[PDB]
Write a structure and sequence with these properties.
Elements (H helix, E strand, L loop, with lengths): L1 E5 L11 H15 L3 E7 L2 H6 L4 E6 L6 E8 L2 E7 L1 H4 L17 H15 L11 E5 L6 H7 L5 E6 L7 E2 L20 E2 L2 E3 H8 L2 E4 L2 H6 L3 H4 L3 H9 L3 E3 L30 H11 L9 E8 L5 H13 L3 E8 L1 H13 L4 E5 L3 H10 L2 E4 L9 H8 L2 E5 L2 H6 L5 H5 L6 E3 L4 H15 L2 H13 L4 H15 L1
Parallel strand pairs: 1-2, 1-6, 2-5, 6-7, 7-11, 11-12, 13-14, 13-16, 14-15, 16-17, 17-18
Antiparallel strand pairs: 3-4, 4-5, 8-10, 9-10
Helix pairs in contact: 1-19, 4-5, 5-6, 10-13, 11-17, 14-18
Bound molecules: adenosine-5'-diphosphate (ADP), the ligand O=S(=O)(O)C[C@H](O)CN1CCN(CCO)CC1 and alpha-D-glucopyranose.
The ligand O=S(=O)(O)C[C@H](O)CN1CCN(CCO)CC1 binds next to α1.
EC number: 2.4.1.21
Pathway: Glycan biosynthesis; glycogen biosynthesis
Function: Synthesizes alpha-1,4-glucan chains using ADP-glucose.
Length: 477
């Protein structure tokens, strides 16, 4: 069974969110579980420089100009790179320019990604051909469309990591992407009078996967599907929609071996976590104090994440004696809101705006609680990292958060299953009740430790997840 993943990022070469973590870890797990998995990425500069053994496979002309298909390895997995400097050799984000505006040729940049994924099924590489093309998110959404147009020389799965990003382009671009004009149809890639790469992925794939069992249910609802729900309801009925939960990469997110930490620690030696908290407090300019709970955020700052609710709730949190440490980047309103809070409450609120990979580990390893009050959350990895690090997640019951965190209710505590704090509604009052629950648990240190050890006993394994994907691939044939 040979599978090609088609996507736009991969940890540690290029990362803007959880997708990169998935692509950095899933393929190696699949290989251990008996599927020959390879990855296809655009040759963005950070990616191209990471793959040092890359060699030329072939040159092709394309609706978007010439490519050199390269192939090399990273961490033992086979990586194909689409080297097309006129599209991909640009500094910064792969998705937008430095003024945060989408590149005007994005339609071509990402249409090409899907085209190469499909061409691989037809022998673009004379020595290797995938049985299944596994496309991820809108960026790779045309891969199943190009496959369909060619008579489906391989099977395809499309996985949604986030349905809010639709890959919308003006209809006239049908002229530019070398797909049959008949594809521009509601029974096709058309959506609200435009081309949607997301729609294309959802429509043309043999099978759709979402990144948690409950998100897969949620996206059949208007509230989470933003117009796509009719298609997804139909595919559900056809047995062509399922959920497979992400794992966590233990090479990188384990307090037991984490080299980025002041002090490594384990489920049975949580006293060794204390030094990380002390150093985190110092680093953030917070009062150094082990008697007080330190809440944390490591997050993109967009409305998805419900961090406006944290701002609303902050005074109540501080009033009860807590501290906040936030690391994040995104909406300037949020950035300034949090910067203003750090200014207003020095020694109680520490804030760092920007993307800092190493610092996220130091937060995860030192904080007592990780706040993930999401409006929607296809899976969420930060809460999984919190569980593994014994930093209790406080989450809204939605998407993967609902699948992975067990509230500290009476039953869950009595059954030995409690692992964090859960609230229901997207408002600050509902958040504040879960925050109070945390303060109550904090006042009972031995119960807190009991819950920490349960959180750290939870397992989210890529090789287990790989087993589910493998069943899917063989079923498709
Ligand atoms: N500002 C940041 N600095 C460092 N890492 C970040 C930052 N923001 C998010 N991350 C990391 O990016 C990943 C986010 O993944 P996830 O929780 O699935 O949410 P999303 O993909 O929606 O951003 C995690 O590895 C998280 O630690
Ligand atoms: O905003 S764009 O649609 O132009 C580009 C991407 O969709 C933005 N993202 C969302 C988060 N991603 C990785 C997080 O898992 C994919 C890049
Ligand atoms: O699948 C990896 C990640 O993809 C998306 O970015 C989602 O927002 C996040 O919930 C998920 O964990």
């Amino acid at each position: 069974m040979q599978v090609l993943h088609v996507c736009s990022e991969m940890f540690p070469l290029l990362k803007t969110g959880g997708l990169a973590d998935v692509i950095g870890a899933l393929p190696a797990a699949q290989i251990a579980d008996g599927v020959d998995a390879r990855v296809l990425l655009p040759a963005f500069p950070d990616i191209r420089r990471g793959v040092t053994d890359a060699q030329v496979v072939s040159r092709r002309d394309t609706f978007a100009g010439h490519i050199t298909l390269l192939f090399g390895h990273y961490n033992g997995v086979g990586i194909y790179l689409i080297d097309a400097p006129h599209l991909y050799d640009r500094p910064g984000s792969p998705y937008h320019d430095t003024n945060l505006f989408a590149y005007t040729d994005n339609v071509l940049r990402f249409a090409l990604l899907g085209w190469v994924g499909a061409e691989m099924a037809s022998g673009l590489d004379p020595f290797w051909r995938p049985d299944v093309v596994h496309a991820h998110d809108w960026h790779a959404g045309l891969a199943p469309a190009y496959l369909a147009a060619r008579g489906r020389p391989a099977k395809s799965v499309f996985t949604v990591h986030n349905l809010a990003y639709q890959g919308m382009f003006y209809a006239h671009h049908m002229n530019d992407i070398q797909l049959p004009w008949s594809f521009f149809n509601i029974h096709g890639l058309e959506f609200n009078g435009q081309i949607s790469f997301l729609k294309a992925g959802l429509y043309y794939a043999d099978h759709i996967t979402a990144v948690s069992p409950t998100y897969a249910r949620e996206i059949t609802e208007p509230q989470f599907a933003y117009g796509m729900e009719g298609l997804l309801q139909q595919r559900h009925r056809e047995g062509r929609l399922s959920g497979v939960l992400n794992g966590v990469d233990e090479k990188i997110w384990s307090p037991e071996t984490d080299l980025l930490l002041a002090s490594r620690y384990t489920r049975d030696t949580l006293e060794d976590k204390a030094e990380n908290k002390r150093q985190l407090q110092i680093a953030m300019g917070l009062k150094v104090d082990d008697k007080v709970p330190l809440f944390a955020v490591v997050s993109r700052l967009t409305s998805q994440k419900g961090l406006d609710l944290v701002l609303e709730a902050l005074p109540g949190l501080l009033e009860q004696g807590g501290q906040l440490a936030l690391l994040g980047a995104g909406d300037p309103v949020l950035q300034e809101g949090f910067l203003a809070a750090a200014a207003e409450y020095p020694g109680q609120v520490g804030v760092q705006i920007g993307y800092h990979e190493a610092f996220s580990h130091r937060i995860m390893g030192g904080a007592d609680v990780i706040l993930v009050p999401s409006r929607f959350e296809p899976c969420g990895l930060t809460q999984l990292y919190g569980l593994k690090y014994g930093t209790l997640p406080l989450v809204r019951r939605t998407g993967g958060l609902a699948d992975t965190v067990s509230d500290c209710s009476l039953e869950n505590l009595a059954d030995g299953v409690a692992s964090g704090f859960v609230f229901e509604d997207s408002n600050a009052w509902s958040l504040l009740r879960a925050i109070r629950r945390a303060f109550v648990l904090w006042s009972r240190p031995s119960l807190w430790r009991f819950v920490q050890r349960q959180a750290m006993a939870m397992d989210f394994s890529w090789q287990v997840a790989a087993k589910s994907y493998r069943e899917l691939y063989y079923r498709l044939k």
